[PDB]
Structure formats: structure tokens, C-alpha cells
mmCIF file of C-alpha atoms in Angstrom:
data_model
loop_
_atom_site.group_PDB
_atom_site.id
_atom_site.type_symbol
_atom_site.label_atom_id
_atom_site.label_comp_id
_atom_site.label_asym_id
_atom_site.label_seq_id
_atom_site.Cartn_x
_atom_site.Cartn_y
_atom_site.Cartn_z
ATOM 1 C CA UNK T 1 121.492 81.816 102.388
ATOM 2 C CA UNK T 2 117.815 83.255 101.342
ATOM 3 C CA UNK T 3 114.341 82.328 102.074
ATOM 4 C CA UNK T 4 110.986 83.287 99.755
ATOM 5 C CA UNK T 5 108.242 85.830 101.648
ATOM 6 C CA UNK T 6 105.175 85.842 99.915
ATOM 7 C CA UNK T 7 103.327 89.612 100.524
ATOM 8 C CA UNK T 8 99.824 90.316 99.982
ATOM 9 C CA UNK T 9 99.546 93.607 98.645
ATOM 10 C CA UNK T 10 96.746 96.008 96.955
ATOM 11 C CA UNK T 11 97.937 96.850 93.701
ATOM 12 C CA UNK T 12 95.667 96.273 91.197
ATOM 13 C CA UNK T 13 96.484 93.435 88.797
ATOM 14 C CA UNK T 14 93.637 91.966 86.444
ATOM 15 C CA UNK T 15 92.854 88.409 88.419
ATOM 16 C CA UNK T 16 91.565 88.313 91.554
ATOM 17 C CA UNK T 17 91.876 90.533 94.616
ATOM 18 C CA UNK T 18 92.835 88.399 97.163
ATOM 19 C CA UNK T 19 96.022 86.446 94.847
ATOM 20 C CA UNK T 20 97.440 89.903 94.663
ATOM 21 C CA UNK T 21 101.192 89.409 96.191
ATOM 22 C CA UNK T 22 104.440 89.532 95.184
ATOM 23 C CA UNK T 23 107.259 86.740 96.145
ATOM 24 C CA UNK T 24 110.201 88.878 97.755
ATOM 25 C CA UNK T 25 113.407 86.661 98.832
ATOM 26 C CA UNK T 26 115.140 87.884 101.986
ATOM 27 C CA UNK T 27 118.844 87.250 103.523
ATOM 28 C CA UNK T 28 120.070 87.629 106.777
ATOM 29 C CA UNK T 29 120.518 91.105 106.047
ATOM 30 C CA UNK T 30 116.965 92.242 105.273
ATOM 31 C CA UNK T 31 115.058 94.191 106.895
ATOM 32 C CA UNK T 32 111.212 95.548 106.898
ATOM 33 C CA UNK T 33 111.571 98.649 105.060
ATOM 34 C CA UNK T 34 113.737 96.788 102.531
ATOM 35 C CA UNK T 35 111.061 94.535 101.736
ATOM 36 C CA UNK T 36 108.435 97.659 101.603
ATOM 37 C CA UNK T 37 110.933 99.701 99.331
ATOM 38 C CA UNK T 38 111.273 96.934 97.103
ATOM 39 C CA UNK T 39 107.413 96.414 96.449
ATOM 40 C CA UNK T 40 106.459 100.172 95.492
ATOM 41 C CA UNK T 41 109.555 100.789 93.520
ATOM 42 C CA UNK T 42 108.421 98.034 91.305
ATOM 43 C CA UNK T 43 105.038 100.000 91.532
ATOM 44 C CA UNK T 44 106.400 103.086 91.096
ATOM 45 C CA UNK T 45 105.153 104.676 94.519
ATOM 46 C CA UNK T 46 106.075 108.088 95.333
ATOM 47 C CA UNK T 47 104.928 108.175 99.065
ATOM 48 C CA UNK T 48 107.068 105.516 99.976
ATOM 49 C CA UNK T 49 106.931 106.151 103.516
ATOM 50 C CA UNK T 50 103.009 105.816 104.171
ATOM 51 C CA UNK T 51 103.575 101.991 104.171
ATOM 52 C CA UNK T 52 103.792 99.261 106.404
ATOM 53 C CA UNK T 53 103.821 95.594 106.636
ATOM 54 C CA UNK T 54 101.535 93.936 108.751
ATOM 55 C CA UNK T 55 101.395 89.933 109.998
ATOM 56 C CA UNK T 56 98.505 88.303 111.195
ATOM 57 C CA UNK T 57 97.343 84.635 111.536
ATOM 58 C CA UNK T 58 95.076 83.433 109.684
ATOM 59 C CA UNK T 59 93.279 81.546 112.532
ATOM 60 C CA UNK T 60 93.063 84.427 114.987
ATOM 61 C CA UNK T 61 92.204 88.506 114.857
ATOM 62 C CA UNK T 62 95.305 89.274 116.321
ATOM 63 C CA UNK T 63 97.948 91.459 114.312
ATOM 64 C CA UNK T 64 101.020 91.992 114.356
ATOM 65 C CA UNK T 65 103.177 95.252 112.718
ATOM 66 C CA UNK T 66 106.687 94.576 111.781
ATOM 67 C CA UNK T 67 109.151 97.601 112.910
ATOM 68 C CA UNK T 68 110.508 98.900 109.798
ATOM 69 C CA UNK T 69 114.011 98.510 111.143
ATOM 70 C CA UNK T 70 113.704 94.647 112.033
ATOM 71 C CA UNK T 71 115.133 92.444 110.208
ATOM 72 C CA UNK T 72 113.026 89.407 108.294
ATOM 73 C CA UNK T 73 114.412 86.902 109.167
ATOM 74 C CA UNK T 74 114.642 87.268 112.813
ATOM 75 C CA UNK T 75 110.593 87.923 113.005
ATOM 76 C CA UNK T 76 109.952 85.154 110.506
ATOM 77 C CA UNK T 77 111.971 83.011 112.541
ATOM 78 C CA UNK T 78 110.218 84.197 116.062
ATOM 79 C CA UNK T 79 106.781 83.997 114.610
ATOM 80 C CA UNK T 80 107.238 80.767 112.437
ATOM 81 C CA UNK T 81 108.314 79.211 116.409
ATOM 82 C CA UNK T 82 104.722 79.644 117.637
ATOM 83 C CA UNK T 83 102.693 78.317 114.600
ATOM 84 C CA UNK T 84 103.934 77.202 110.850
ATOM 85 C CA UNK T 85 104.138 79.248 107.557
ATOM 86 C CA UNK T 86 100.678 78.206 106.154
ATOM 87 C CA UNK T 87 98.754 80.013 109.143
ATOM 88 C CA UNK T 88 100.084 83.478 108.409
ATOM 89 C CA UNK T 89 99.631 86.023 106.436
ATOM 90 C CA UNK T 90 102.020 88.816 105.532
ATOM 91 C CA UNK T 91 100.242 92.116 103.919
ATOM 92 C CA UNK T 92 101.817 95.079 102.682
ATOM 93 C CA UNK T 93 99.682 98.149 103.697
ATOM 94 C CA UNK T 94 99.432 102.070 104.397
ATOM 95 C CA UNK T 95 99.354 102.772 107.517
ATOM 96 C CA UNK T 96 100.812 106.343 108.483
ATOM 97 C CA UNK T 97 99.129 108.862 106.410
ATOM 98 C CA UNK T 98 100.384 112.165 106.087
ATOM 99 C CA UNK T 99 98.264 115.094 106.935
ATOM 100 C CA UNK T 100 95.828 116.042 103.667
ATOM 101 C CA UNK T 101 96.333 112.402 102.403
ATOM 102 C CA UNK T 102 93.529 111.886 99.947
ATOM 103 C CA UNK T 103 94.393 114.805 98.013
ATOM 104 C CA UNK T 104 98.043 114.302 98.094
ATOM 105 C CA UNK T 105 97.625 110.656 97.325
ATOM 106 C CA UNK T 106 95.810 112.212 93.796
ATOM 107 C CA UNK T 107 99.819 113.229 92.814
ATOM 108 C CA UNK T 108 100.421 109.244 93.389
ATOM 109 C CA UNK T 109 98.179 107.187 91.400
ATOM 110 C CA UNK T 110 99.706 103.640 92.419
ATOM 111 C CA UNK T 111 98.905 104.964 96.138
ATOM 112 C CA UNK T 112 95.616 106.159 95.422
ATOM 113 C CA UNK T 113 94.385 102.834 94.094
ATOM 114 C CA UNK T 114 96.440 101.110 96.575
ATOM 115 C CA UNK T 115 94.667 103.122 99.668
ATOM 116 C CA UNK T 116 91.639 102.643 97.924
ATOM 117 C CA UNK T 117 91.714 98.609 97.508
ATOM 118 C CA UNK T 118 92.800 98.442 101.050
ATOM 119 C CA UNK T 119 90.272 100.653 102.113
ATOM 120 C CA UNK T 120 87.854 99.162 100.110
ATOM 121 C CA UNK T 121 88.756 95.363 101.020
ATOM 122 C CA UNK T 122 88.323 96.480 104.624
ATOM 123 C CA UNK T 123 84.968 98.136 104.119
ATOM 124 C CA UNK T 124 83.328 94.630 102.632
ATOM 125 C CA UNK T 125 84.792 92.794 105.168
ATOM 126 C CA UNK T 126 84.235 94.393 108.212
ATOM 127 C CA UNK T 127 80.818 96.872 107.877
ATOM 128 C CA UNK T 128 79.425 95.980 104.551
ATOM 129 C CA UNK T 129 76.503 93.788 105.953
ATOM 130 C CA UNK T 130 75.530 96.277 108.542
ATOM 131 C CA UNK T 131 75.780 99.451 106.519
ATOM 132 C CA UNK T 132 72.596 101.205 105.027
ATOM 133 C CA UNK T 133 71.269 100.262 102.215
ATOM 134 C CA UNK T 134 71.467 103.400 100.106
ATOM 135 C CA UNK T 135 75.628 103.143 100.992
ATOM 136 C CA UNK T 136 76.007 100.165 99.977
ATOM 137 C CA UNK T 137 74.496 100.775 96.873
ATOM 138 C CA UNK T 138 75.972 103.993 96.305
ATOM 139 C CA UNK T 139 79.515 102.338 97.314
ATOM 140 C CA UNK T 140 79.120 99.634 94.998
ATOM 141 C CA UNK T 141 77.627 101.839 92.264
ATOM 142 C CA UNK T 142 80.973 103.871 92.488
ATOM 143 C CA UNK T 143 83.099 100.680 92.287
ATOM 144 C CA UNK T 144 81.453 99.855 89.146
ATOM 145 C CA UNK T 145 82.068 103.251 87.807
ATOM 146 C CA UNK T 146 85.847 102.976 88.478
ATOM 147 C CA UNK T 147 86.083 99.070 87.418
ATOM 148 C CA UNK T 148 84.426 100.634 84.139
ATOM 149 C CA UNK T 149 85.839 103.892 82.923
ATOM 150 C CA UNK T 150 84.764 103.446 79.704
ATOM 151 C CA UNK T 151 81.284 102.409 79.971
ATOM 152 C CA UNK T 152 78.370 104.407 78.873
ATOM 153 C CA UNK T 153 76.399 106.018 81.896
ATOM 154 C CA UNK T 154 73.478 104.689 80.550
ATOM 155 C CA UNK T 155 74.897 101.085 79.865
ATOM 156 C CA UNK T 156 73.183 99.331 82.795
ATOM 157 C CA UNK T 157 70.035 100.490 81.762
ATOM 158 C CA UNK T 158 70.217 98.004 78.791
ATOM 159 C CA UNK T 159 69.284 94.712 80.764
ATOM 160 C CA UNK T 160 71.670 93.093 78.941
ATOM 161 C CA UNK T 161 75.197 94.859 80.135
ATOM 162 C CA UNK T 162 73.372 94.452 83.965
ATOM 163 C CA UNK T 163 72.971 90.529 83.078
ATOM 164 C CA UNK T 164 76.918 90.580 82.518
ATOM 165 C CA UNK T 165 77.050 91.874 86.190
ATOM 166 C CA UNK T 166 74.747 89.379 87.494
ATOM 167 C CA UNK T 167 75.554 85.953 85.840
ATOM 168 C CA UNK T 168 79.395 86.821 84.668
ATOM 169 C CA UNK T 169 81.358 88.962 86.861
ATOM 170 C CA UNK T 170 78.780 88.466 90.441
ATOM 171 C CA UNK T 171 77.656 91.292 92.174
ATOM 172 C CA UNK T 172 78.853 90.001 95.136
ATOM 173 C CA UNK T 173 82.379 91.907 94.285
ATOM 174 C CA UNK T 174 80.321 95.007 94.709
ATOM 175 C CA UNK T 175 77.614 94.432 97.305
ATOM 176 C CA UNK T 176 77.150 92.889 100.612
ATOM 177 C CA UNK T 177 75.486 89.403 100.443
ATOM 178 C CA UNK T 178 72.792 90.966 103.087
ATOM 179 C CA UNK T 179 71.799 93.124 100.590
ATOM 180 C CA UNK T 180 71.723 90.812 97.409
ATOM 181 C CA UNK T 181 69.640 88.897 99.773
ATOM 182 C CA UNK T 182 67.482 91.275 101.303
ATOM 183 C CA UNK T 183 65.399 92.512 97.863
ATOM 184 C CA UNK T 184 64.320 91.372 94.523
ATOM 185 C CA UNK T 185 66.732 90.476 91.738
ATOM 186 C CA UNK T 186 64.244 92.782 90.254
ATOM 187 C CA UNK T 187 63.719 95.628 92.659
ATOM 188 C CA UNK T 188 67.787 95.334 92.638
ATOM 189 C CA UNK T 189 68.367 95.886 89.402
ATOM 190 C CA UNK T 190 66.261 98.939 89.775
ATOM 191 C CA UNK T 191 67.771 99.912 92.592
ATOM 192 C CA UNK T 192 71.281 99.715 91.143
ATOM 193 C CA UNK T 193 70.620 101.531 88.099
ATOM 194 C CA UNK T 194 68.825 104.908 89.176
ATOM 195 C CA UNK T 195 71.902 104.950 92.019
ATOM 196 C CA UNK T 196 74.468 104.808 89.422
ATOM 197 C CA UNK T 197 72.526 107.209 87.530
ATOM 198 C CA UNK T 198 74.174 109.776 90.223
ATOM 199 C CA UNK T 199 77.879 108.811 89.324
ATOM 200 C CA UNK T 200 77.263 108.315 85.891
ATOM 201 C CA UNK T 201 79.798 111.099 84.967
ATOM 202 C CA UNK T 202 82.559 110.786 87.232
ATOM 203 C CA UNK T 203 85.948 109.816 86.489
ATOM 204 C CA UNK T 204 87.953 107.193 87.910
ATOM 205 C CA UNK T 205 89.575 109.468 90.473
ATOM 206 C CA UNK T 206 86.592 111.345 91.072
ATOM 207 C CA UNK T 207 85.064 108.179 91.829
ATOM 208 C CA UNK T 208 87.521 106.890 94.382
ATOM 209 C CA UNK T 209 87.300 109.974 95.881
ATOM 210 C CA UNK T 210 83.208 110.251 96.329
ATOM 211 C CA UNK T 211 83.570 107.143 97.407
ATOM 212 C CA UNK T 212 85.999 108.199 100.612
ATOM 213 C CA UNK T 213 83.546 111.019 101.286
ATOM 214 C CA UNK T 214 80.242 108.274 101.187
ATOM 215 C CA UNK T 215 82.769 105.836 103.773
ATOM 216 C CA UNK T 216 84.360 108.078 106.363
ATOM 217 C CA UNK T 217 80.811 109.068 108.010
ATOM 218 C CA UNK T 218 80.077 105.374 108.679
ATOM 219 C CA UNK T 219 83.942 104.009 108.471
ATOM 220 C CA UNK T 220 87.177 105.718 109.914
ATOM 221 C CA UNK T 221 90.210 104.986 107.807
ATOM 222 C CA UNK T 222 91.992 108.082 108.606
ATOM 223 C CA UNK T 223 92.664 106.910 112.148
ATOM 224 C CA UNK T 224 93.271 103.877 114.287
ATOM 225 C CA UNK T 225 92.517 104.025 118.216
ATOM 226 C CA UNK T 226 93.277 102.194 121.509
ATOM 227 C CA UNK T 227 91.745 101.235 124.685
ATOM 228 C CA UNK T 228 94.762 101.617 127.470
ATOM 229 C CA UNK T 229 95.724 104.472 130.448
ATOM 230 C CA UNK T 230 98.119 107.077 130.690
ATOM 231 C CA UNK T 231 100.341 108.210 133.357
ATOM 232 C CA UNK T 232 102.760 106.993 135.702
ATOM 233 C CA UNK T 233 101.232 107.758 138.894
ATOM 234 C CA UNK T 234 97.355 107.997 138.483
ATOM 235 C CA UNK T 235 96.697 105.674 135.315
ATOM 236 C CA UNK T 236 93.713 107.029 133.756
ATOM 237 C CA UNK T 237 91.625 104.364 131.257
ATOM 238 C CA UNK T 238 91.004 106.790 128.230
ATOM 239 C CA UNK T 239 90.792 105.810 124.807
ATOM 240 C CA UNK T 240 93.702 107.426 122.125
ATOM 241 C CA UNK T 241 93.464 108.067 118.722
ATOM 242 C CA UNK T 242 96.032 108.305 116.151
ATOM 243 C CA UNK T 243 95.641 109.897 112.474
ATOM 244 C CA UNK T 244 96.818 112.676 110.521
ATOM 245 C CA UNK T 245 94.086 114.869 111.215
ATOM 246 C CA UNK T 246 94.776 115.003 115.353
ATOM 247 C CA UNK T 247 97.857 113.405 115.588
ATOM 248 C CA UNK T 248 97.759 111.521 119.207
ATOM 249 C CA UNK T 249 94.445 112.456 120.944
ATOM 250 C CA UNK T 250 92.553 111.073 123.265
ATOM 251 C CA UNK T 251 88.123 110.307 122.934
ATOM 252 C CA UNK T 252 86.011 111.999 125.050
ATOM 253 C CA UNK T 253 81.546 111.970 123.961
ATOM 254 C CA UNK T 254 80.885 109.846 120.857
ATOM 255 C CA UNK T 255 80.938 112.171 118.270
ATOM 256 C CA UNK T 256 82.965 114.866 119.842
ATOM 257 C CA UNK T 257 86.268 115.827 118.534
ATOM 258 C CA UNK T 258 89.074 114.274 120.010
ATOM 259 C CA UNK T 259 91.037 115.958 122.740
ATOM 260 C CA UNK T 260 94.604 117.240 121.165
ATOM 261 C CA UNK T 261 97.747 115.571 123.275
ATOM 262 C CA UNK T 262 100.976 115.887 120.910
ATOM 263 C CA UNK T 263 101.645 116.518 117.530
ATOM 264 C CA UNK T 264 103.889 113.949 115.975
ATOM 265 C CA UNK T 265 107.147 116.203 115.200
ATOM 266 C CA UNK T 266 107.127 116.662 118.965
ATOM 267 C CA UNK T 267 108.060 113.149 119.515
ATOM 268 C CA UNK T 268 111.821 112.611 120.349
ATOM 269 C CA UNK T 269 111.745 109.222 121.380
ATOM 270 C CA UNK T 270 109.680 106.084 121.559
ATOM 271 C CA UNK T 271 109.867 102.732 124.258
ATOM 272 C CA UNK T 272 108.202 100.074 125.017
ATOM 273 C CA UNK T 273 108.381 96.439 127.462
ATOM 274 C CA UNK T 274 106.335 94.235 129.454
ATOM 275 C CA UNK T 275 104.807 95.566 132.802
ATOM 276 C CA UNK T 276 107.622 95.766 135.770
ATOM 277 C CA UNK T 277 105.516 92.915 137.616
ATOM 278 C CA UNK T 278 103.084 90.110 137.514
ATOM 279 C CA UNK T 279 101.570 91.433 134.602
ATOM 280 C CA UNK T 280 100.487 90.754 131.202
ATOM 281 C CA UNK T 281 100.541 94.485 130.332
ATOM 282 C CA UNK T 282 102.756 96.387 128.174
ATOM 283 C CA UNK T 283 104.608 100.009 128.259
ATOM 284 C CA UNK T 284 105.151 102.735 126.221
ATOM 285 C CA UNK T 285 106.693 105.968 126.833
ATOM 286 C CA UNK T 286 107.005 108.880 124.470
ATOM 287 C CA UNK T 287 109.319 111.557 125.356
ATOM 288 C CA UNK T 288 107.656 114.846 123.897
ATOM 289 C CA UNK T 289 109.675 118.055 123.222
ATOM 290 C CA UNK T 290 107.320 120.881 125.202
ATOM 291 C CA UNK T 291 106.115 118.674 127.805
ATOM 292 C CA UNK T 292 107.972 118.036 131.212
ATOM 293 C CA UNK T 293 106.699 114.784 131.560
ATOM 294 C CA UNK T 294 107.171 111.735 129.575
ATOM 295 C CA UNK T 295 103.798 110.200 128.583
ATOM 296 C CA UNK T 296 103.060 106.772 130.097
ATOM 297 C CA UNK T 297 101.151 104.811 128.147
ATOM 298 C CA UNK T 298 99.659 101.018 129.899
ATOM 299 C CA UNK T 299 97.937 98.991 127.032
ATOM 300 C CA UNK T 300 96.204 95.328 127.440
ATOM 301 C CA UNK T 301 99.449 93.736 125.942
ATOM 302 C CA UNK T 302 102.759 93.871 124.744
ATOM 303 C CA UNK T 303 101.161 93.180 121.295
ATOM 304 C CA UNK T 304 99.611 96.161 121.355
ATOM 305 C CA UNK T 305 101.986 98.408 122.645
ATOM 306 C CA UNK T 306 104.677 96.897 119.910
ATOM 307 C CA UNK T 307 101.655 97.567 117.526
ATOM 308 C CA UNK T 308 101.168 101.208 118.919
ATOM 309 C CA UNK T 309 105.041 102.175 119.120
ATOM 310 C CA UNK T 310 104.989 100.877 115.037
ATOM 311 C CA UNK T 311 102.601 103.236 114.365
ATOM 312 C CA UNK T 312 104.416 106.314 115.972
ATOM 313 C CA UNK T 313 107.229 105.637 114.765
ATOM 314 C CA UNK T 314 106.178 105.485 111.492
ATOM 315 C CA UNK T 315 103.975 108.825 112.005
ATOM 316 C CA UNK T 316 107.731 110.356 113.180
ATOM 317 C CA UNK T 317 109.675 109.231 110.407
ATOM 318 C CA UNK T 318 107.119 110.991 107.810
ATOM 319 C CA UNK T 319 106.074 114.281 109.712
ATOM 320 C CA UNK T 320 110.011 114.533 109.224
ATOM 321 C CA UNK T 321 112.593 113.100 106.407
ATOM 322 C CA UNK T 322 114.148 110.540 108.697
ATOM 323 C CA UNK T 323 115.145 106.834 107.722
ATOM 324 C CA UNK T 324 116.007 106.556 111.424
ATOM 325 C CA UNK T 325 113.791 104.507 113.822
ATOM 326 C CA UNK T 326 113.079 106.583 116.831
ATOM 327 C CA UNK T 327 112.304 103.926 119.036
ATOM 328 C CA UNK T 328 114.871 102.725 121.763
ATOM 329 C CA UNK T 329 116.168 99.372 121.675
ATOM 330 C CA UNK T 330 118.894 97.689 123.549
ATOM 331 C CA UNK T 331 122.313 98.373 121.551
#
């Protein structure tokens, strides 16, 4: 008949961060973007197409992106074959983001926040401990503004409102414990009050927004790259990068820009499959409109190049109005 999916997602809803999910049931007719539809409707999203849902289990760092057009059951089923329900973890997010993003995002409040949890939940986890100190502070400062819309700017200089941060709420859902750790409860304090003093006016979306500006120098969410070669004669090892802002590029220097390739409304088709040989590598080819050539891509895995061809295809289904997957399966 139906089963129950349980789908972490990042809309805000007064409790705790990590129990926020929503229980979807699914039939044999279900499919990915049904599942995603259903969530931000309830939510009211307006850029319905900038999200995605992504599995991983909970024991290792590998992910995996469900195709839109897939149906539920049939990946629950494959995935639930090589470990059980319990180790996995299914997690609504936005993953193709269209070309000014942050400021169209302002025109979709649920999306904003939503981006900005995710975002946010990613920055904690991944770079909070090694980040300077002044960005974490200014980081958490900003949370703390948004959290609080309408707190005085001057409240945490009364001891008092800070000692509700400290001993009630735990400043630990706004700082890195290397940095709770690494100074005074005193020299803290001081510390987190003349910061704040900076965003003291700002607005709730003016504060999501400095805080974007504060992350991107030391944290890229606009983009998501890969270690693999290209070609289908001379494989070259290069390293592509996929966003908005340069559509599929390639890195060159460290901080150089990347090198241009395609732009994602050039993309007619998408296709992927495990290496032609003894091989534990995966394809993908792209066929671009204005280039004679088909670009080979070799990644590491299939994972990753069913991970990759999810993220074009997503890219190709927003730079245009299509519903229609443009990857090639077999009918």
C-alpha cells in the first residue's frame, strides 16, 4: 500500500534544530519531486525548484542525491538492502540555486530562512572550530540578532539578559565549543557584547544577509566542486565547479576565478554508468548545444557521478521551466 518517510528539513519551528522533519507517506507511485513539492507547499515556498533531497548514512560521509524523477520506493527499497532504516538519514535541502539567489531568495521568506538554517547548520558543523575568532563571534552575534528581533541593542549589556544566554538557552547554539573554551567566561562576555554592538540595528533579513557576506570569504555555499577528468581521449585530472555564479567551470590557482566551460541552458542532455572495464569509476557525458564534442566526464565513483548528474539536472530544469528530467535512462 504506503510506507512513512521521515525528512529532515530546515524550516524553522520553535524546538530544536535537529527534530525539524516532517513524516511524508509514499505509494508505489511517488516520486522525489513529489515528496519535495509536498514539503514547501505546506511551507509556502515560492522557489520550489531550488530543492533537493539528499540521503546519507548516518555511519559514513558518503551522500547520496535522489533524482527528482525516481520514485521512493524503489530507492528506499535499494538503499534499505545495504543497511536498515535507523542508519539513514533523509534531508530535504537547496541545492540548485538560481543565478542572484540571495537577493531573490529576499521575495521568499520560507527560502531565505530555509537557505539560511542549512547554511548555517553546515557552517557549525563543518568550519566553526577552525574559523577566526572575530567570525565566529561576529556570526554568532548575528544569529542572536535574528533569534531576537525584538531585543534592545543594548540588552546584553545588562549582565542579566547575557546570563539568560549563558545558563538558559547555551551559547553553544551560537559559538564553536573551541571558542567558548579558548577565553574567559569573562573576557567572552566582553567580547560578545562590543561585537554585537555592530549589528545592533539590523533587521532580521538584514541580518541573514550580513551574515552570508561574513561566511562566503571563509565558506562557499554558492558552489559545490569535484575532483575527476574530462575527455574521452586524453583524460585530464582537473577539478569542476558548479554554482550559479559560473555555471560548470573548472579550478585553476587557489584563489583565481574559475575557468568558464558551459552555461547550464546549453545542456541538452545528461548520462551517466559505470566505467566500460575493470573499473570502479563512473561516467558522465553532457551533450552541450555550441560545442562539437560531448564532454566526458571520469569521476572516482558511480556515487559521485549519480551525485554530479543530480545536480545538473537540477541546474537544467531551473535555468529553464522544465518538469522534465534531462538525463537519459533506459526506457
Amino acid at each position: 500500500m504506503e510506507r512513512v518517510l521521515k525528512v529532515f528539513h530546515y524550516f524553522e519551528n520553535s524546538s530544536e534544530p535537529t527534530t525539524w522533519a516532517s513524516i511524508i507517506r509514499h505509494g508505489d507511485a511517488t516520486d522525489v519531486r513529489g515528496i519535495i513539492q509536498k514539503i514547501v507547499d505546506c511551507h509556502k515556498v515560492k522557489n520550489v525548484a531550488c530543492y533537493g533531497l539528499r540521503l546519507s548514512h548516518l555511519q559514513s560521509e558518503e551522500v547520496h542525491w535522489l533524482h527528482l524523477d525516481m520514485g521512493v520506493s524503489n530507492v528506499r527499497e535499494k538503499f534499505e538492502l545495504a543497511h536498515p532504516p535507523e542508519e539513514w538519514k533523509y534531508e530535504l535541502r537547496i541545492r540548485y540555486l538560481p543565478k542572484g539567489f540571495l537577493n531573490q531568495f529576499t521575495e521568499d521568506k520560507p527560502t531565505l530562512n530555509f537557505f539560511y538554517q542549512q547554511v548555517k547548520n553546515d557552517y557549525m558543523l563543518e568550519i566553526a572550530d577552525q574559523v577566526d575568532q572575530e567570525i565566529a563571534l561576529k556570526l554568532g552575534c548575528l544569529e542572536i540578532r535574528r533569534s531576537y528581533g525584538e531585543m534592545r541593542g543594548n540588552a546584553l549589556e545588562k549582565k542579566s539578559n547575557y546570563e539568560v544566554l549563558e545558563k538558559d538557552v547555551g551559547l553553544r547554539r551560537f559559538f564553536p565549543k573551541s571558542l567558548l573554551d579558548s577565553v574567559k567566561a569573562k573576557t567572552l562576555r566582553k567580547l560578545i557584547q562590543q561585537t554585537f554592538r555592530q549589528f545592533a540595528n539590523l533587521n532580521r533579513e538584514e541580518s541573514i544577509l550580513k551574515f552570508f557576506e561574513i561566511l562566503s570569504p571563509v565558506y562557499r555555499f554558492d558552489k559545490e566542486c569535484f575532483k575527476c577528468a574530462l575527455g574521452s581521449s586524453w583524460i585530464i585530472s582537473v577539478e569542476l565547479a558548479i554554482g550559479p555564479e559560473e555555471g560548470i567551470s573548472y579550478l585553476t590557482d587557489k584563489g583565481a576565478n574559475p575557468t568558464h566551460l558551459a552555461d547550464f541552458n546549453q545542456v541538452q542532455t545528461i548520462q551517466y554508468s559505470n566505467s566500460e572495464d575493470k573499473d570502479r569509476k563512473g561516467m558522465l557525458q553532457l551533450k552541450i548545444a555550441g560545442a562539437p564534442e560531448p564532454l566526458t566526464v571520469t569521476a572516482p565513483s558511480l556515487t559521485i557521478a549519480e551525485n554530479m548528474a543530480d545536480l545538473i539536472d537540477g541546474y537544467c530544469r531551473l535555468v529553464n521551466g522544465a518538469t522534465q528530467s534531462f538525463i537519459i535512462r533506459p526506457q
